[PDB]
């Protein structure tokens, strides 16, 4: 169901690649599949992420770098290796906040 919609979701950019603030000062690219996780373990932790239940319940489109953002940040040393983590986490925030307006701005 909603956790049902976040699969769906997950699973159809699963190996669609995200780019993340790198340990030096450029981006690397990274997707679902590099976590090494099944998806239903994926799902479970993208449950934690502030919103993701709200929009999912509502078909919208998710935020999937966020999502993965933070999972990979959870769960992969080798993500954590490659990524500034605070920059991350503040990246995590931004995407929160662009898809949380988007839910209350004009269309």
């Known amino acids: 169901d909603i956790e049902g919609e976040v699969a769906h979701q997950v ?3 699963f190996s ?5 603030p790198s340990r030096s000062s450029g981006i690397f690219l990274w997707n679902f599949e590099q ?15 502030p919103g993701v239940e709200r929009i999912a319940e509502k078909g919208g489109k998710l935020p999937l770098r966020c ?3 933070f999972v ?3 769960s992969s040393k080798r993500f ?3 990524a500034d983590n605070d ?3 503040r990246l995590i925030q931004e995407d929160i906040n662009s898809y949380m307006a988007r839910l209350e701005e004009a269309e």
Do not use: P
Request: overall charge positive; charged content about 30%; aromatic content about 6%.
């Open 11 to 13: 699973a159809e950019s």
């Open 16 to 20: 669609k690649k995200y780019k993340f």
């Open 35 to 49: 976590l090494k996780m099944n998806l239903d373990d994926i799902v479970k932790a993208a449950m934690n992420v």
């Open 67 to 69: 999502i993965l953002g």
């Open 72 to 74: 990979a940040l959870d």
């Open 80 to 82: 954590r290796l490659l």
């Open 87 to 89: 920059k991350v986490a």
